[PDB]
Write a protein that binds this ligand. Structure first.
Ligand SMILES: C[S@@+](CC[C@H](N)C(=O)[O-])C[C@H]1O[C@@H](n2cnc3c(N)ncnc32)[C@H](O)[C@@H]1O
Ligand SMILES: C[S@@+](CC[C@H](N)C(=O)[O-])C[C@H]1O[C@@H](n2cnc3c(N)ncnc32)[C@H](O)[C@@H]1O
Ligand code: SF4
Ligand code: SF4
Ligand code: SF4
Ligand code: SF4
Lengths: 326, 327
């Protein structure tokens, strides 16, 4: 069994499938930076679906059970159903999820379902249509994505919703969004906003922690804690007492979780990373694969990359924050 | 003035173990089968002296230690413990000195300790029913005796908190009676998840009651709200009674391990340094180091080196092995 320097196994391959996106969310792909001038990866500089499938097969043999399709906005990747069909035929792979702004769900949703997609995570940072647009800078209304969510649900997809909260910006959406998704029996998850400051610890200025979110929510809702489904479950779940619909809170910053992190990551340009943060360019899997290698030489290269992994960025910021309290 | 270890963690707390002796034989700590008649405890001269401890505490205060916890063993068994408290009370930079005790000897020594500057104690008490408690301590001590010690300690002006380790099948039926009793005494109680490493070798949950489960038990008898953390990376998760307002704590030693904020150095009763509560091998011989003849600077430089190479994270390792054993 394959474990890194901190004793963590490989479970979870995050597959980035494009660098492109149809939103320009102020904190992720700001319009300044990613303007009209931006040149994105060309077609041939992305991994093919066949190379993706090959990589996934090899990872399955090392322990990976789950694959999360991301980008970018994944639905801009043109024949995404084809990847999903190939991923769904890999034996050790048990779950495939997709993480999306949901805009293209009415165009590509049925195709993806028919290829074997069953679960999606839709990010939506407000339910107000105005405030959603000022976040996304592409004149989309939240109402539009709500309708996409309803379509996805109608064709049999399981939908969960991810909201990153910022304390001058998203503060006040917490209660309306719980009410709306409570009614629709859809699991929503509030996520603490991550931002490292000058002192190299966490910056709590635009943060609303799990514990303050929870003070807000109890004032408006009657609620019970749900016991962790399995050990090391990341999200802290709660249940509305009247109808048992669940929501979750993700303690990105106030309670870092690197010790249970089993996530390996392939960028859209085809480079291996052991963590969502990372200064240097990672191993060039794309280059390696295109210069003829056996499956066995691929497996051993991924094994060696994992066994050398000691990433724990969020825990490091956590420790530095303790140090800065002085 | 601020020293960090290999995982970015500053030194902040010093646990000083002052004896290996104890007046109990708690089944999960000093079982009588191991610590019975033929056990040999440390000779007196192999303990650190109080001067050695004060000198060690001083140099650690220069490296950023702010809190000292006195423990053991049962620290009240150490003769003239009040002389140690008095020397530690004279050290610049130390803001808090705490004692953790089973409490049995608090009537005997409490006033002396108070006089010497002690103001805070943490009393370990795993049950409030007498028959049960006797079955745990294995020395025929009644919980009622410990309760009277607690009430004397508060009366002389010590601040008392209570710690309770819960093992499923043994004392988990005690969570409610103890919450009720100390709620009415305005004393903060804390429940701690039992740590036990299984064969395999992540955590053994076989009795383990988790913080989550403890809370499901608790919210039925009492109406409760969270208390937000007083500071960032506070280990205990606090709650308060809506009545009233008395706080209690729950400690997720096993279900939510917290090595990332761990700022604890430890000296054993035989005077060896440990960077963690769990250790399989002997630590650096601080005791022989200082008895070999060293300067305060040489001492400080060694403590700084011991901390800079520290990478312990036992509970997180166990947590990772647990995730890894799920396959
Ligand atoms: C990069 S998008 C990729 C998939 C798709 N475009 C989407 O947004 O659903 C994935 C997530 O990163 C999150 N994100 C970016 N920066 C973040 C930050 N500083 N703190 C918390 N989440 C962040 C966004 O909320 C988003 O849900
Ligand atoms: C070594 S005693 C020293 C102080 C004093 N003799 C007392 O018992 O309070 C310190 C603590 O270690 C704790 N402890 C020992 N083994 C434990 C375990 N497996 N899980 C949780 N706590 C444990 C005991 O409950 C006790 O409170
Ligand atoms: S939609 Fe997703 S990838 Fe695009 S700018 Fe927003 S968070 Fe970023
Ligand atoms: S910051 Fe920690 S939990 Fe997040 S991807 Fe990196 S190692 Fe994993
Ligand atoms: S009283 Fe404290 S040191 Fe003594 S056996 Fe019990 S837990 Fe251990
Ligand atoms: S197990 Fe972790 S939290 Fe506990 S003393 Fe060791 S390093 Fe610190």
């Amino acid at each position: 069994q394959i474990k890194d320097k901190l004793g963590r196994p490989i479970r979870d391959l995050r597959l980035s499938v494009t660098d492109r996106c149809n939103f320009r969310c102020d904190y992720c792909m700001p319009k300044e930076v990613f303007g009209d001038d931006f040149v994105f990866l060309p077609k041939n500089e992305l991994l093919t679906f066949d190379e993706m499938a090959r990589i996934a097969k090899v990872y399955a043999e090392l322990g990976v059970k789950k694959i999360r399709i991301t980008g970018g906005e994944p639905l801009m990747r043109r024949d995404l159903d084809v990847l999903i069909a190939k991923l769904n035929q890999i034996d050790g792979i048990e779950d495939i999820g997709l993480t999306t702004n949901g805009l293209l769900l009415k165009k590509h949703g049925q195709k993806l379902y028919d290829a074997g997609l069953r679960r999606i995570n839709v990010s939506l940072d407000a339910i107000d249509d105005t405030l959603f647009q000022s976040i996304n800078n592409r004149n989309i209304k939240a109402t539009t994505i709500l309708e996409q969510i309803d379509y996805a649900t109608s064709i049999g997809l399981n939908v969960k919703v991810n909201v990153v909260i910022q304390k001058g910006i998203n503060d006040d959406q917490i209660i309306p969004m719980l009410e709306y998704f409570k009614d629709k029996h859809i699991e929503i998850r509030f996520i603490e906003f991550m931002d490292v400051g000058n002192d190299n610890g966490w910056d709590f200025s635009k943060v609303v922690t799990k514990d303050e979110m929870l003070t807000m929510i109890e004032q408006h809702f009657e609620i019970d804690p749900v016991e962790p489904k399995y050990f090391g479950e990341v999200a802290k779940y709660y249940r509305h007492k009247d109808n048992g619909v669940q929501f979750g809170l993700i303690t990105s910053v106030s309670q870092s979780f690197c010790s249970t992190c089993t996530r390996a990551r392939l960028s859209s340009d085809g480079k291996f990373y052991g963590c969502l943060f990372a200064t240097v360019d990672g191993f060039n899997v794309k280059a390696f694969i295109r210069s003829g290698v056996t499956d066995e030489e691929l497996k051993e290269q991924f094994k060696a990359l994992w066994q050398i992994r000691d990433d724990r960025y969020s825990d490091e910021r956590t420790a530095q924050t303790v140090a800065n309290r002085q």
